[PDB]
Each structure stands twice: as C-alpha cells, then as structure tokens.
Amino acid sequence: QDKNLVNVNLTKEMKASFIDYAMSVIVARALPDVRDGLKPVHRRILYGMNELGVTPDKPHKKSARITGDVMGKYHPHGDSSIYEAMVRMAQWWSYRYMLVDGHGNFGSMDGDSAAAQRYTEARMSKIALEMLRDINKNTVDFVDNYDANEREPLVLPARFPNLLVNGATGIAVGMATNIPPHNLGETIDAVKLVMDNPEVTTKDLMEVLPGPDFPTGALVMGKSGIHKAYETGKGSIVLRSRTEIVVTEFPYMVNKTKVHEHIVRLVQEKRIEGITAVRDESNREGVFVIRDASANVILNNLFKMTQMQTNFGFNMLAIQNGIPKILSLRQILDAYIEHQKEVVVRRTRFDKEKAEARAHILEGLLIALDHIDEVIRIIRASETDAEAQAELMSKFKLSERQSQAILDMRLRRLTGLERDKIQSEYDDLLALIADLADILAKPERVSQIIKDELDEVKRKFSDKRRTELMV
Amino acid sequence: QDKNLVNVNLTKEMKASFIDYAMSVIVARALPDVRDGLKPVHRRILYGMNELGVTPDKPHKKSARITGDVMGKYHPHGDSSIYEAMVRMAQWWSYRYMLVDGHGNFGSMDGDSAAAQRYTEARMSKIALEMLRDINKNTVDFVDNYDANEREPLVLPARFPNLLVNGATGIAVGMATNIPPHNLGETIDAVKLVMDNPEVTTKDLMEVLPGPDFPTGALVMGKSGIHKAYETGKGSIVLRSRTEIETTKTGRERIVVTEFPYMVNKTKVHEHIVRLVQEKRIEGITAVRDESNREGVRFVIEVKRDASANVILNNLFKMTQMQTNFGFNMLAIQNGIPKILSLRQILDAYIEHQKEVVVRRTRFDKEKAEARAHILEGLLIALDHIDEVIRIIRASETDAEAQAELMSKFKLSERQSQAILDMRLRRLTGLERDKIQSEYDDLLALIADLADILAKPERVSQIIKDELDEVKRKFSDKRRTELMV
Amino acid sequence: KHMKSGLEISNLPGKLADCSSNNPAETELFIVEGDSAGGSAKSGRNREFQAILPIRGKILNVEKASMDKILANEEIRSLFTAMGTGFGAEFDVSKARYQKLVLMTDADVDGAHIRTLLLTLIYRYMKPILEAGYVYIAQPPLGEMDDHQLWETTMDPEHRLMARVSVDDAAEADKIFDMLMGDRVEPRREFIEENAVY
Amino acid sequence: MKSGLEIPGKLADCSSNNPAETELFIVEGDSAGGSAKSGRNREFQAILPIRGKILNVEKASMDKILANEEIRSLFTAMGTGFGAEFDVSKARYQKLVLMTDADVDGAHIRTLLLTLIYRYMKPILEAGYVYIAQPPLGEMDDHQLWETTMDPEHRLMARVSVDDAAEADKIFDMLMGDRVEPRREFIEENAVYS
DNA sequence: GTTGTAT
DNA sequence: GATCATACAAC
DNA sequence: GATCATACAAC
DNA sequence: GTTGTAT
Ligand SMILES: C[C@H]1COc2c(N3CCN(C)CC3)c(F)cc3c(=O)c(C(=O)O)cn1c23
Ligand SMILES: C[C@H]1COc2c(N3CCN(C)CC3)c(F)cc3c(=O)c(C(=O)O)cn1c23
Ligand SMILES: [Mg+2]
Ligand SMILES: [Mg+2]
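The joint structure predicted for all components is written out below.
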C-alpha cells in the first residue's frame, strides 16, 4: 500500500521509453560518425589507449589494464563489450586497416575467439595515430563523461577517411547501416579529386576509386551495383571466392570453417556429387582444397548454394549533424573534407595563439634582461611579490603575465648567452605567427595542407588493392 | 619426427614440478606474512589502491579500474580473483575490520554475490590507511613486479596487528593456516604489554586479550582451547550461535537466533533445518521464518505446543552449523619460511617489524631534513651576497663556469650552487630571507630530535606505543564475541 | 494473520526471493534486471510482503516471437510460474500470487528497453493483470546502489513514488505495440523519424 | 590422410590417419588453444584444451574419476579405451605432448596430467608416447608458438621415461597421495626458501 | 560438503 | 552476466 | 574461463 | 542463421 501513487498511461510510457532507447541506440552505439567514422566504443578505446600512453612507439599494455580504464572512465558498460571491440580493431580480416596492434591470441579466421585480457596486451596502431593527430591542439570538441568526472572528445581528428576505408556496421533500431571497406590510397585520391573539381560526378569519382577493397581480397562480380551505391547510398553487389579445386580467398565476413561444415552437410544429402574430399590445408602464411564430375558444375553449384558467393547490400547510413542520414559517396566525402578543414584551422589557430602568447612573455624577458640591474633593484626594494609586480609593470610598461614571467626567472637565465638565446627564439616566432596568420587568412593553404598531409598518409600506410573487380 | 630430443625421468620431473607449485603456493599465495598479515593479492590490492589515489579522502573509483591496474601492474592472475578478494575485504562479516569501502551490491551474508565490477566502485578504508602510513619514506623494501617494469613492496608498514585482528585462512599445499579475528584495542593492549614486560606469560597476556572477537559476535564455549592455541598455535574452540527463547503472542515457545558463528551462512542453515524438519530427523518445529532486516539478524524457529524449545535447540546445535568448532592453526610466513607460531611469537614478530619501520622513517626523515637545510645554508649565503653572486653569474658564459665560480668563491657544493642558480628573482625580496631563516632554524630542531630518536631505542618503542594508542583510539571497537565457560 | 512457515515445497523458480506473507493483496513482486540489482533488492526488501524475481538479459519480444518459442522461453516461464496465474486458456487473475507487480528496471536506456519488452508481455499474455491494475512501474529518484539506498528511495511505500499503468483505448494500445514492437520496420522507422527530437 | 565427412566438441583434429606421425597437444585452456590451433600444421598435429585443473586420480573415487568430463575427453581423443578396454594398439596418436603454461599453475597441471597418465594410461608411458613441451602461453602469437615449440625441425621435446616403477609408484603416492603428513615432510626436506 | 586463492 | 569441476587441508 | 538467450535490420 | 554492440 503506497502513499504517493501516480497514474501512467500504457501507450504514453511505451512511446516515451521506446523513443528513449531508440535515439540512444542510434546516435550513440550502433551508428558511426560520418566524420571520424567511429562509434562511441571504438572512439573511447582509441582515446583511451591514447591517454594510457600505449602509443605505437611505446610498449604494449595488458588488455585488462586498457579495458579497466576505458570502462572506469568513458564507456560505462561491460569488459566483454569493449575488449571484444578492441579485438576486431586488431584483426586483419575484420578491419581493412587495423587500428590496434596486440600481442597474443586475438582470434582466428575460423571463428576462434581471442584469449583472456590477462594474456593479451595491445597498443595503438601506427595508422591509428593519424586518427588522433593534434587531438591536443583544440582540433576537437570535448564533453563530460557519464560519471561527469572526466572529459572525452565528441570526435577524433581522423586524418584519414576512416568510415569509407574501414567500413561500417550496422544493426541499430528501425534502421541498419552497412558500408564496405576501401583502399586507403584510392579513398584519399577521391578526397583530393573532390577538393579539386567540386563539379565532379559519380562516374569521375569511380575513376580513382573502382569500388570496395575487402581485407580478405576475393572478387566482386558486377559494377552496376557499385555505381547506384555510390550515387544513392543504397545498392547490392556479389562477392565470390578466389579459386584455382582449391579456394584461396573467401568473401567478406565469411568463415572458412563454417563453409567447411556446411559443405560437408551438402555432401551427405544428395545435394552434390563429385565431392570426393573437402579439406582445409590453410597455414599461418596463407589459405582450402576440395572422377567424372566436371567440377565446374559442382564448383558453380557450391558458389550458388553455399556461402562461397554472397551478396553485399550497400546501405551507407551514418550520423551527420546529430541525425542519422542515408549518405552517398559524395555526401560522405564532402562531410569528411569539411571535418578536415575544421581541424587544420582549429590546429592552426591553436599554434597561432601559443606562439603569440610565447612571444609576449618573450618580449618582457628581453626588456628585463636589458634592465636586469633596475629589475633586481625593483624586486630587492619590494617587500611583497605583489608590490614587486606592480612596480615592474609601471616602470617597464609590462603586463601582469610578463611581470609574472620576470619574477619567475631563474638566476641561471641571467647569463650573457641567454639574451641572444631568447632573441633567436623570438625572431623565429614572429615568422611562425606571420605564417600561421596567412594560413587562417588564405582558405587555399588550409586546403593544400590537407591534400599534402593526406598524400603523406597514403605514402606511409596505403596498401595494394586486394579485391579484384570483375564483370 | 623431431631432431633434438631429451629424456626426462617421471619421478624426476614429478618431484620438480610439484616442489615448484608447492613453494609457489605456500610463500606466494595461500599463507600470509606474519608482519603485515597479508597475502600477495591483498597486499597488491592495497598498494595498488594507494597508487590509484583512492584514499579515504578521495572519491571512489570503478571496481574494474582498480582490478584493472592491479592485474596489469602487480597481480598476474585472473580479473575475477582480484575483484573477488577486494570485495571480501569490504564485508563487515568477512573482515573484522574492513580494508575497503565499496559503493553498491557488495554481496550479503546470505551468500549473495557482489554486483558486477561495472556497477560497484571502491576505495581504501580509513583504517587501511594505517597499513600504508609512511609507505613512501623507505620503511619497506620493494621489488620488481612480474613484468619487471613496475616496483612493488615486499611487505607493508602495517601500523596495526592485521594478522591477529583480521585473522587468516588458509589452504595451501601440505599445510593450511587458520587464525581468528580479534578486537583491535585488545590486540594493541597485548602488543603494548609484551613491549613493557618481556617476562609476560600467555596467562598475563590473555588478561588483556581474552580471545577471538569475530565480526558477527556469537558465543565461545570453553576457553581451555583458547589458551592452548595461544601457547602452541594449535587448538580447538567451540562456537555457538547467540540465541534466546521468546513467547509468541499465542503462548508458545519461539527460538530466536541473533548471531550465527563465524563463516556460517544463515540461508544455508535455514535450508538445512527444513531438510531435517521435513525428514523427521527433528520434530517439534512449527515453522522456520527468517525475519532479518537491513538492521539486524532475526532467524526465528517457532516450536509447537507440547514441545521443549530447549530440546529442539540442542538438537539444532548438534546437527546444524548453528554450532561449530574453530581449528586454531596459527601458521604464517616468517623469515621466508612457513611456521606454526604461538601468540607471543606473532606479537614479537609485529613489535619488531614495528621497530624497523619507525627507525627507517626517522632516518628517512632525517636524511631529508638535513639535505634541505644544506640547501637552505647555500641559499642564505647567496641571499647575503646577491650582488657578487649575480655578478659571477652574469659575467659567466656557461653555467658550468658560473657554478664552478660560486662553489669556489662562496665555498659551496654542487648541490648548493645549482640551488642558487635556480633561484627565482621573486625569491630576492626583503621578506624572503627571514622566511628561509625560520625554516632553517626549524630544521635544526627536527634534525636534533630525529638524531635523538635514532640514538635512543627507548624513544622508538615509546613512539610506537603512542602511535598504537592512536590507532586504537580512532578505530577500536567494542567486543562482539562473548567468551564463556 | 496468515503467513508461510518454511518447510513448504512451493516448487517455485530457483531465483525469486519470495516473501513471507501469503496475502495476494498486500505482497509485492519486483521484476528486476540482473542479479546485480536483484541482490540489492533481495537484501533490504522487507522480506515479508516483497518478493524479488530477477529477469536476466532482454526478454523475448512476443510480438515477433513464434508461440512455440514463447512456450520454450525460461525467462517468461519463470515469471508465469511466480505469479501462479496461468497461461492463455488458464489465466486466472483470481489466482495470482501478487496484487502488485512492480517493474523495476535500470535507470539507463537499456532499462527502458527491458521495460518495453515486459509491458508487451504483460499486455499480450497477461492482459487481465493489467486490466486489474496490478502492473506498476518503479519511479527511482540500480546495481550501483546500496541496500539502504534502494529501500529508502523506491522500495519503501512511505517514501517511494510508484506509477499505475492504466490503459485508455485498447484500440490505440493494440496499434502502439503493433508499430513499436511489431515485425514491421518501416512504420517503426517512420515513427522514430517523426517523434524524435535530437 | 583422412577424408572428413565422418563424425569431442573441442579438440582440433589433424588431417592424417597415421598414428605413427600424428601428434596430440594437450594445452590448458582455449586461451592457449587458439594460439596452438592457429599454427599447428593440421596434418599430423591435433590440439585438445584441458579446461580447468585436471582431477587428481591418486585421491579420487573411481566413481568421480569415471565422471570427470575432462578425462573422458582426453581418453575419447586418444581412442585407447579404459581399464579392461585399454588398447595401446589403437591409440590415435603416437605422440601426446603436455603443453601446459610456463607458470607454477601449469607446473601443477603437469603433475596432475602425469599422475592421470601413469595410473590410467601406463601402457602409453611405458611405450614412450608421452612427451613434454619445452617452451622458452596465451600471451604468444601463432608464429611465436609454431616457431618455438610446435615445429619438429626445431623445438625441444622431453620424452617421459620411467626407471624404477617402485620409486615412481612411491613418488605419486607421496606427492599426489592421500596422506598429507608425508607430503609436508617432503616439502620441508627438498625445498630451499632463503 | 565447506572454507579461500588459483586454473 | 550466471553457472559449471577442480586443487589443496582440516574438520 | 566457456557456454548459454535475446533485441535490432537486413540478405 | 549470421552479422555486431548491448543486457
Ligand atoms: C546481461 C547478461 C544476461 O544474460 C546473458 C546470457 N543469458 C541470457 C539469459 N539466459 C537465461 C542465460 C544466458 C547470455 F547468454 C550471455 C550474456 C553475455 O554475454 C553478457 C555480457 O555482458 O557479455 C551478459 N549477459 C548474458
Ligand atoms: C579457468 C577456468 C576453468 O574452468 C572453470 C570451470 N570449469 C572447469 C571445467 N569444467 C569442464 C567446466 C567448469 C569452472 F566451473 C569455474 C571457473 C572459474 O570460476 C574461473 C575463474 O577464473 O573465476 C575460471 N575457470 C573456471
Ligand atoms: Mg557477452
Ligand atoms: Mg572462479
């Protein structure tokens, strides 16, 4: 028997509760950001490893160490949910361009799970570092964490088109997104091509970007789907296996073992003759071997009945401006480019403000070193550091900071070679402040800096095309 | 086949593999250290918590975080094993004096398991802070961690006898320890007693340390074993649930349990009684209701008319875990090896570890105090001769030459010279010296005092006693377990 | 007054911290998520008229689940076993063990989902219970909450704030479930897109 | 070589049917199983994870022994049979390698597995089919374990050979036996601490 | 069977 | 997230 | 540690 | 059935 009871209509609660879980699952779990092409977990694992200091140059850390933090700080969920995400970012078959470098068991192509976070340690991947470049130069907006006792970035700089390169997936609520991976180089080529001729067309963009490039390789039969996919954001494509009867490369998100098990089932059920044997002679250095049968007939059947040939349905759905949107190739490129521009500017402004600030305090030190005799005479006569600062500011026309900078001067910096050492630095800053000032004033440079810094990535991290397109 | 193959003798490998695991568990898992009364995982959790900065003053931190760094920096085992051990030392019924403060479902007496790490958050308990006091003043040796890229303490300072106070258990290989929790204040009174009168006897000690003081309370039957345990480290004690008969509103007897024995699960006994009542192994029970509230234990066994509650009571004491025995097996690691110690031996062990920690601190405090005053002497000379000093600096090209001159002109050490070179211009005010003077003067006193403590062993013990009285004065409880003949 | 006396067989679910009373007009059944909260409820629940029945994971969506799958689900099974009401051609509202079914899910979005899955079950296979005004919803001010915290805030009737689930138009009710929970995605997609403020 | 399509849940079997070259790796846990399974040469090398700590048969009721799921897996793998059905001439593997972790715990699992083999598979040990991996395990890549312990051309094995059965029988009884006092003495005797 | 660190 | 067998000693 | 069910969309 | 973040 309650005292303060209230009435709540069923339909009202249902609509309220559902929308609450729908929006939350959509714009904060299952769908990636059109910009950095990351979903909350992956973005938190990355920013995590970053703060943890598991950079590509530093040594690995035990996953329990990483998961423990990412959880106790940013991602308010289960270890399994995180460590599982971290494990996909370290599998060559999962990501076209891995975002983690782990040691130990991190699973297999045969569905074999990873080991315990007590046996596996990991760290950022070299290319992943590009996702964080200049993160500490106000290139990104930060927010409070669930605990409200920590801060995290809403997005990463993402110095490479992560979304398109690695892909996206997928299951949300009332909607699902499915984006295939692409070659690092080719993508960058598209990004630049757009920055050059905005009047470009789908056909033109496909000149430097054939289509998908899955980390497994294989083949994509047909091109008509790729086009409609890049134009509307929705389409379908077929993915076959590279064979010679031996199978060398299996399609995207396809398990060799499962195919093996299913092939065995089809063999013991009048579903295909010829099936003399079906082995898997796959090594740690490469991948599946399988009279009177023609094979070409039995081989053609396996691809049309089993999983050796699957269909990939384009459904490029991301989060742009807080809302989920079905974007096309162009819409995604323009969205990334704009995010890139914001970062170079933001970073440029950051350096700008620092240099100028540094020079201001540098101008004072010089003034002081020039009149060290009077400055010291002023301080010595001063009773409190408060008075000592007012005097210096009144005499040498200095600001509170400059004055404070002078009062915090170590004696060892009152030598001769010092003055000239500050001058040399100061002179260099004026040139820096003057160079940065031109970049913020000339939209053209920012664009060029982007192009340049991209080609540097394409030159350090681009692979050879794995997926051979057919017709 | 293979190329280079060796041959291993079954008996040979067996004895080797077993001896490895045997010692591994004994000195590095199962039994605790006589000094801080801790086992590897408990010590790694405490120290780890200290580093994470989750002190009594600071706010709690997600459990997964705590175990995450402890497993990644110190304890090379499963996550569960650490979180499990952490939760336990946060339960008022498992630890006589908890060493951890948690927030959320940390389990219940009825055997309930604490919530997932993703829900619970923890930190050190005010008292646990005594286990670490002066951890950073070189009072405890450190060693490389399993990874050889982190440094951890072999033992803790432990400013209160955590072995006797919280007990131990216990299963290893070839051996197993079992020590009952005691009352803080009492244990301290025992430690202080053995310090002031070395000729004290188990009897004399038991005058201030009557016996076990379990967290739940209950009763102890027969002190004969208690004196046997304290004098030999081995002994048997009888534990019984504190009970009381009540008269229902209808007018029949009602058996009420308020304090089950140590390590006895209420629910487990509730299920045990039902299995016996429905099995005709015990007749006369009208009902068994658990009326325990988040503010006390109330386990009621109402008897039927024409039935002696007492008769049923004793039957319960004899058949259920409502009455059990406690196997005193006071076994702890001492000098690297496992030993069955008496009460006195465990105290003597604590008092010693206590003397060492204090001295080291005193020394550490002295070496620092002096090192400072040395720099203060330099800064003074410098602030007395600022003109000539600044002259030497400015007239010098390289700092190496500037320092070399200052040392040579003012007769200063390399340490002193650098100090002068690093002085901020703000330090060259009028009021600055009189400040540096006061500090310096204060240091001469401290160094005098500290120099004395290290000269007089009488002061070290007195410092210990005084500091115990404070721990006692701040964390001591009232006895919970009633001892009776 | 009438109350249990142990020794009883009951044969109820392994979980379910059943209370002491036997008056289906005072006792309460709390459907919690996970034992992380169940444990907080179980201990500090006034084990006299409040029973705790932990539901693990996400309850099956009856709107998209084959009846053969509904009769196989142990999670929904334990629930009907706890009420003692009956299923379909046996549902006797006059034989329910509790006249107060309090849904107490986590204060997170995921909690709001389980809350959604439950109500569909209660409205699709226990309508009589809702039509009798037994289904209530806890209004917290859960795993990261202590004993005294849970009780003093939402479990104590002297200070707790509950909400009675009332149905207005059964026609509008059958539609809301057919849209939000129905196998139809387009409608649900349109709904979300129409009634959502980012 | 087999042909598949034939018919334990775990245990990644090889591809050959020649119990003269084939090998079974008994590793502890699926943590070390994946690493071992992902670079084993699935032709004459099969893996079988021993989940948890093996039951000590030198102190177990022959009823609980015939109950243990782990011991049934290892026997089911071998294909030898049990007790009166022991058929060494039917072993599916001429090389059983004990590849436990390099920690103390693994060392323990070594003794358990040995007691199990010596007591209820003596014919196997008597024939020299039992070896012991010699690592320098989940914290190890595929090529790391393959290029260190699993590759025949390299690696280093330890053939288990019994000399004085009486001494062997005595040892197990002492260490893995029921009597504890004798075991302690052994600890006190052959053990240097400080 | 139960206890508490481990696989 | 919950549960499942096991080592080890002593009772 | 391994294993169990389930929502959610889309082939 | 399977994909991947979730309870
Ligand atoms: C939240 C709990 C709910 O229960 C779970 C499962 N069950 C659902 C109910 N069934 C009766 C028994 C099995 C399950 F199979 C897997 C998981 C799981 O992987 C998981 C996690 O955090 O990673 C968490 N949970 C799981
Ligand atoms: C190391 C693994 C070994 O397997 C385990 C168990 N089994 C042993 C084998 N049985 C066939 C199935 C059950 C078990 F029942 C419990 C645990 C457990 O609690 C645990 C942990 O780290 O907390 C770890 N493990 C366990
Ligand atoms: Mg899971
Ligand atoms: Mg366990």
